[PDB]
């Protein structure tokens, strides 16, 4: 798997690919690894699929209930701290996952969370077996001053690179862009493909 989350001035971009493998065996080419879990929050999953999917459902339920009770959205840092506690509580019988949580409250944030509850905020992060290849592209090409379009292209590239060298990664790239203005918007497939073509790539 390959997932990525980056921050920009007033935006968060999150992307994944869709491949699901039982070992070397590509069982499903269009699994979903990027989910909206609140008005301005998205989550990406890597690791054991059953553990990831359970946690997606809990975070949807709990962030919705929280919002109704508080009449405000959970701060992104709060979402991370919640996940941090949940996962640490069961560290010796853990959720075998790596999560990215990204969103906008008073500012953009991306947090990266491990199966022990370690949570850390960063200007960008990636997870899954393809992540090293992504970290390569980003180290070389990421800029803080990038525009949302530039950023979307960047992530398409990073994941394309990952897909070319990680056999556990493949399929269509999903991208979401989270802004105060328009909220969490999942870019349409035909737009991503267009950019893939315009940038001169494959799959």
């Amino acid at each position: 798997t390959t997932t990525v989350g980056i921050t920009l001035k007033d935006a968060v971009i999150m992307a994944t690919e869709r491949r699901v493998t039982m070992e070397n065996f590509i069982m499903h080419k269009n699994g979903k690894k990027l989910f909206q879990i609140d008005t301005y929050t998205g989550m990406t999953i890597a690791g054991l699929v059953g553990d990831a999917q359970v946690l997606v459902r809990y975070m949807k339920a709990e962030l919705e209930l929280y919002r109704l009770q508080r009449r405000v959205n959970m701060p992104i840092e709060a979402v991370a701290t919640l996940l941090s506690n949940m996962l640490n509580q069961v560290k010796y019988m853990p959720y075998m996952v790596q999560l990215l949580v990204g969103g906008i409250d008073t500012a953009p944030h991306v947090f990266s969370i491990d199966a022990a509850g370690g949570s850390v905020e960063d200007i960008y992060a990636s997870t899954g077996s393809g992540s090293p290849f992504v970290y390569g592209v980003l180290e070389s090409q990421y800029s803080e001053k990038m525009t949302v379009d530039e950023g979307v292209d960047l992530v398409i590239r990073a994941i394309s690179a990952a897909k070319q060298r990680d056999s556990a990664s493949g399929g269509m790239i999903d991208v979401a862009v989270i802004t105060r203005k328009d909220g969490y918007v999942q870019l349409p497939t035909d737009q991503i493909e267009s950019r893939i073509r315009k940038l001169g790539l494959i799959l």
Binding site: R57, A61, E64, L65, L68
Partner: protein
């Protein structure tokens, strides 16, 4: 005699202590719900105890999720506790099945919790009624639910002090499939019919949901255009 414990039947087979719980409901502000063309709405009156109170707080219409809401009448602390049971119950069902196919089941779960407290000694019933209104896979729904745990589905209904006023007015005036705007006007009109003239209706709450959308809470200005 037969009057003084939830676990005691009267010789005519009644549970007076439950009937009494039902009187508590008559002491609340009046609220009503009604179905209209591709949707359902709720309108609630409100005691405004003083001008030192904060308006944008402790709402009579409460969202259970994005597609389901409730109004309540009776003991306010009981009602608060029940609304939060309703919310947690909703989320449990979504986590189990991924969605809330039929609202009747949420309502039944809340109604069962209420029934339970009309059977085991050591507890009193909740002195609360609720109306639940939302959209599910059957369509627009409107239910009520009392301290006994009794449930009914309606086209229109009400709860609170002015219940009987509002239910008559609607028995005479209600038609199905009204457009939203007319349904809201009929509702305000019905609500006024329960007041004691002289007495005038201040800013009430109004929420509405239509098929394929999320709920929508009317702000005080939008509400004003109907007063």
């Amino acid at each position: 005699a037969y009057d003084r414990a939830i676990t005691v039947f009267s010789p005519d087979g009644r549970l007076f202590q439950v009937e009494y719980a039902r009187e508590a409901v008559k002491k609340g502000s009046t609220a009503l719900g009604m179905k209209f063309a591709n949707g359902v709405l709720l309108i609630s009156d409100k005691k405004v105890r003083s001008r030192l109170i904060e308006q944008n707080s402790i709402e009579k219409i409460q969202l259970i999720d994005d597609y389901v809401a409730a109004v309540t009448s009776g003991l306010v602390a009981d009602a608060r506790v029940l609304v939060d049971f309703a919310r947690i119950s909703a989320q449990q069902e979504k986590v189990t099945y991924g969605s809330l196919v039929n609202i009747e089941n949420l309502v039944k779960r809340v109604a069962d919790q209420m029934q339970q407290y009309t059977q085991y000694g050591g507890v009193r019933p909740y002195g609360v009624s609720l109306i639940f209104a939302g959209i599910d896979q059957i369509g627009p729904r409107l239910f009520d639910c009392d301290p006994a745990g009794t449930i009914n589905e309606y086209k229109a209904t009400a709860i609170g002090s002015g219940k009987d006023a509002v239910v008559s007015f609607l028995e005479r005036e209600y038609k199905e499939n009204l457009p939203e705007k007319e349904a809201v006007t009929l509702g305000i009109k019905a609500l006024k019919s329960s007041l004691e003239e002289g007495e005038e209706l201040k800013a009430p709450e109004i929420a509405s949901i239509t098929v394929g959308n999320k709920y929508r809470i009317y702000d005080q200005e939008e509400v004003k255009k109907f007063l």
